[PDB]
């Protein structure tokens, strides 16, 4: 059994209760059944066998196949999601196109989000032009590398734009080829075709010369159809002589998957004869990072459940809460309104109610229990499809799930009827606190709470210190980019673009090495030094900022150094108070132990520059912001005793190698 | 820790400076390590070059380079063996000359340890600042394909340095030192590029001082360099500073004989080491153009049958023309490379002489390669009983260089220069180099070779090709086309590829083993032929155009290279499809790629048309394809590699 693999997939079949929310059990009994993985729609099975031949207001059902339900290693190893069948960018009615993209475009975002390692795709037509350009761009801007199985039709008529009158030169092959130079003859280890088999095999799949064709492919599957008999034995259900040499001849790698596709309405040996199609298909074959920027990128769940193993952030979260409900519930309050901002997968939801709880039997005891009405608010949609079912497994339906931007909150809020909040909670921190947008993100809130509204965090403070180490320098300016990586987003100003090949491209005017070094990183600091016995404070944000402060700063933070040395840049950091005495800190001094929810991070000088010992550092560092994003403007004076004084170029100018948008 | 985890290795030094050493590296290194230390630092000169002095006027000069591969297979080589260059060498003497004379060295000696094919390797720095010297090792390191671990020898301390004055040394320091070299070769990856610290008997102020001793945790530390200039003990200061730096156990340590004249009990060689412990595609090769280093050889020499074959058409040779009724054949072997042809023509007249009938043969083995002639020096003395005289020269000069030296016209020449797609290595010129002083009778083995290509199928050969990428450190390797690096606005190496990378990657050929692939033909066609000796001078220029019928919906990306070479008569050798030589690995297939796959089908008519031209300084391939449907429609692809650009074979 073990050295081939045989997926299950998901069809109109076996489309039973609650499937989606019970893929657990699912893959379960279906592994019982003797195959492992699974091909099931990513969309949920109430979205992708849903059909669009209705009125003008027959809408597509929201994406419902919640993460939550079955822990992600598991939704990476087994779990292969398919697009709904019902999207078709290429149809001939121009709206339904549209719809077809836009929805196209909402499966993609949330096969990256479950975080998946392979992917169907099951193309209808000869020719998928407009299918074509949307995931040519789509797999060439992502910084993600998941595999792609293009499932094929069975035969060019199965086609919806086959006219048995103009097809000159078609067959299955040709279809493949056009689509994958459609889409930029992506690397055939991550583009990867899968062939439809089924009762009828076409010349071209048994004509010699032509089945040789998949071997100079980049074949990686085959979809088989239940379309067939139980010749011999107790009716063992066998394949033709064809089909056999043709499962044998192609077979060349063990890596090869093989679906299996239910056609026939065969609830089969009332479901125990799958096992029996799975054995007769056998037996015929055998360190640097980017700043995360939550704000205008969607988190996948890989991210949230890491940032979940990291449990004391939100046990400090807890205690920071009850604090809270401490200081406003000695008041002798019923009832108090809070606002879970950016809620992720919900860690700090669940806990926050743990700490109305325990707030309750530990103040509240013999006496009237204050209650908490939870809002918690988010923008991530897939996020938002955890939230959900958390909410309703959980959390008993008592939170009320708001989908948005929070800095809109302030417009739908009297709308909707939402009331004023007492306690505002985000949790929305770099590694330099407020690399990733906080203080533009909770600004956004303040129009809407009362000056009684105590936030948490209430304040945060990034902090800086200079190194020394040829490694860490060294490995930030050789970072280069390979062609399948040339047209991932600049973190800059600029974005991707179509070249004079139409092909997707990620220029960089100011270079590719000053690309490098002005940026902000997190690393784990490895073979480092330090050249100040302690760091400095660079920059301060409390919350709420009911004066409406500017969010921009400016700085001069200076050291002096105490050896010959070359100085390679600074290693940032940040602490936070969430309520008074409650708070946490990545500073050297002041670190909370056992945390590994942050990495430091590094701002980085172009050259390492010499010092000595006597010699005064002036890092200028200026947070400037935009209508459209904020970034970092840095740079050193170093001066000598005798006042001599010299100065480096001022990196990162206008945002263009490194620009946080929103 | 455990014994094997904590490595340790023996400096060379006038210490032990044996008779013929240079000739016995093997049995040294095996007392060595049965002294219980598994590496070994050693001058690639050898020791007679290594260690000698100038001192007299230009009338004395530097030994050559003479420690041979063969004395040791190549693995062997790559395992134990760290080289070093010769202390002498100082591209940074205050002497223009000798520093000239140091520079041209220094580059001998490194192309040695390439030729070698050691994998780490080790320079001292004798000086505070040593400019010409990192001037030298920069271009080096950037523009060499080779990555191979280097180790920056420091000085023992700030005042032993050639360019010492206690009164400019404001604030210098070992460390100083190190800042400014690698700083001077441009920051290469310290994964690669690593300094090795001089522990003296005197401990320096910057390597007790915690504060300072940390400077060379930041640093890619790589080896300690331990003088004997100890007691076997070791003092509590040195202890603490040899633990305190020492973090990964990949650190490496070195034993440098000073102070004892020799170990009192032989044994107190064995005790230091222990009371330290107890602290897929490729270029065609181009022989002419590059220098091989000795694995391409070692591996080339696996090739049983192409020397067997050669043999041959040897004993063929001897036959046809030893017939005659002489006792007597000259022959000239044109690259002899490590001699393997060499020993296989003296072979085949010692074999033949048995069988056949005497006929005594003289051979006459040219060679460009100055490091292969170590290689045919220690040949010829080891095996060939200075029967054959070895000429180190361009064998296009020969002519010139044939009354000089007393040589005597060829009746035979013997050579192999040709690659996977036959011509591509440039024999052709070459042989014309050696045509003009040949004798009417001269026999040219091989005689002939032409070129064959057969159309395919492979996206992945394709995509493999197209995405070819250059990261950071490979920025200034050469292209394999008419450019060649230059200093950009950082006065930093850079290969510019003004045509663009894809491409600069499209218009090559390439050798790949065929993966996963179709043909999409089923025999191959004639490309371009010669024949030698080119007794005519006939112009190496080829332009031909080949033609093929396709027979299925497919996406055409190139054709597969072949080349046939008859060597005399009836033997030969081929790479072809059919006609292939069995059990040869010599020559994988040559690729020529289209830039796009060219989609075909049915009945489609395929005309590759390709110009072989050839320049006052090199060669090159000008190919493309003209499609024509069954109803006559004709169209044509780019001309690819049009004036060598992409690819030029120099010479
Ligand atoms: N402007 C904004 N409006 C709404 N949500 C935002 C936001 N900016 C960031 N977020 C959300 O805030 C989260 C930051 S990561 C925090 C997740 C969760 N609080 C945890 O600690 O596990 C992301 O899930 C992101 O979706
Ligand atoms: N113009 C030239 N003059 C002298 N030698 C040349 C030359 N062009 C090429 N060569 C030599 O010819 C050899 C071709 S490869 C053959 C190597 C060797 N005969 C073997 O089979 O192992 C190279 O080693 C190269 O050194």
């Known amino acids: 059994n073990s050295r081939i693999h045989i997926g ?10 609650n499937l989606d929310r019970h893929v657990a059990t699912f893959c379960t009994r279906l592994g019982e059944f003797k195959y492992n993985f699974v091909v099931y729609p990513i969309g949920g099975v109430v979205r992708a066998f849903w059909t669009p031949n209705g009125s003008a207001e027959n809408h597509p059902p929201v994406i419902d196949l919640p993460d939550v339900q079955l822990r992600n290693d598991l939704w990476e190893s087994y779990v292969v999601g398919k697009i709904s069948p019902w999207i078709d960018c290429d149809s001939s009615d121009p709206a339904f196109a549209s719809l077809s993209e836009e929805h196209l475009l909402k499966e993609l975002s949330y096969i990256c989000y479950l975080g998946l390692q392979t992917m ?144 026939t309405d065969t609830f089969k040996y009332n479901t125990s004869i799958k096992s029996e199609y799975s054995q007769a298909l056998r037996h015929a074959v055998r360190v640097l990072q980017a700043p995360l920027q939550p704000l205008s990128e969607n988190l996948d769940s890989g ?66 229990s204050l209650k908490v ?38 417009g739908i809020a009297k709308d909707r009827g939402f009331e ?37 965090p209430q304040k945060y403070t990034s902090y800086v210190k200079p190194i020394m180490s040829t490694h860490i320098h060294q490995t930030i300016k050789a970072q280069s980019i390979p062609y399948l990586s040339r047209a991932i987003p600049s973190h800059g100003r600029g974005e991707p673009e179509l070249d004079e090949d139409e092909m997707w491209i990620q220029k960089y005017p100011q270079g590719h090495v000053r690309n490098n070094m002005d940026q902000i990183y997190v690393v784990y600091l490895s073979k480092y030094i330090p050249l100040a016995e302690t760091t400095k404070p660079v920059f301060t944000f409390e919350h709420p900022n009911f004066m409406n402060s500017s969010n921009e700063r400016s700085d001069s ?41 942050w990495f430091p991070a590094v701002i980085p000088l172009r050259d390492q520059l010499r010092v000595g010992e006597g010699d005064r550092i002036s890092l200028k560092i200026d947070r400037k912001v935009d209508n459209t994003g904020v970034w970092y403007e840095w740079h050193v004076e170093k001066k000598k005793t005798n006042g001599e004084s010299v100065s480096t170029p001022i990196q990162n100018p206008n945002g263009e190698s490194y620009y946080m948008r929103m």
């Not at 919900?346 to 509240?364: A, H, Q, V």
């Not at 309703?392 to 809109?408: A, G, L, N, P, Q």
């Open 303 to 368: 991210v949230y459940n890491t940032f979940e193993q990291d449990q004391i952030k939100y046990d400090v979260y807890g205690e920071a809460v009850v604090g809270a409900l401490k200081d406003l519930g000695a008041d002798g309050r019923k009832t108090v309104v809070i606002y879970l901002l950016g809620g992720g997968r919900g860690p700090i939801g669940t806990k926050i109610l743990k700490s109305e709880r325990e707030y309750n039997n530990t103040f509240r005891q013999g006496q009237e």
């Open 8 to 17: 299950w997939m998901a069809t109109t079949l076996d489309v039973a209760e």
């Open 557 to 597: 933070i200076e050291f002096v150094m105490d050896r010959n040395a070359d100085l390679m840049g600074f290693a940032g950091y940040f602490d936070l108070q969430l309520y008074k005495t409650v708070m946490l800190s990545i500073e050297p001094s002041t670190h909370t132990p056992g945390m590994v929810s």
């Open 373 to 410: 009405k939870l809002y918690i608010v988010e923008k991530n949609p897939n996020a938002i499809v955890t939230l959900k079912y958390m909410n309703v497994r959980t959390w008993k339906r008592r939170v009320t799930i708001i989908e948005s931007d929070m800095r809109s909150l302030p």
């Open 420 to 456: 004023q909040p007492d306690i505002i909670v985000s949790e929305l921190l770099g590694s330099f606190g407020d690399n990733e947008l906080s203080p533009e993100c909770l600004d956004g809130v303040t129009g809407f709470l009362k000056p009684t509204t105590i936030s948490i």
């Open 120 to 263: 169907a795709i099951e193309l209808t037509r000869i020719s998928s032009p407009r299918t074509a350009a949307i995931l040519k761009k789509w797999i060439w801007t992502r910084n993600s590398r998941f595999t792609v199985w293009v499932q094929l039709p069975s035969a060019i008529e199965k086609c919806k734009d086959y006219d048995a009158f103009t097809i000159e030169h078609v067959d299955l092959w040709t279809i493949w080829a056009d689509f994958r130079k459609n889409c930029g003859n992506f690397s055939g280890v991550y583009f990867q075709v899968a062939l439809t088999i089924s009762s009828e095999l076409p010349d071209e799949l048994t004509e010699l010369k032509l089945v040789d064709r998949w071997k100079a492919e980049p074949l990686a599957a085959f979809v088989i159809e239940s379309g067939l008999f139980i010749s011999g034995r107790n009716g063992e259900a066998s394949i033709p002589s064809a089909h056999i040499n043709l499962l044998k001849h192609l077979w060349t790698t063990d890596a090869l998957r093989i679906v299996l596709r239910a056609t």
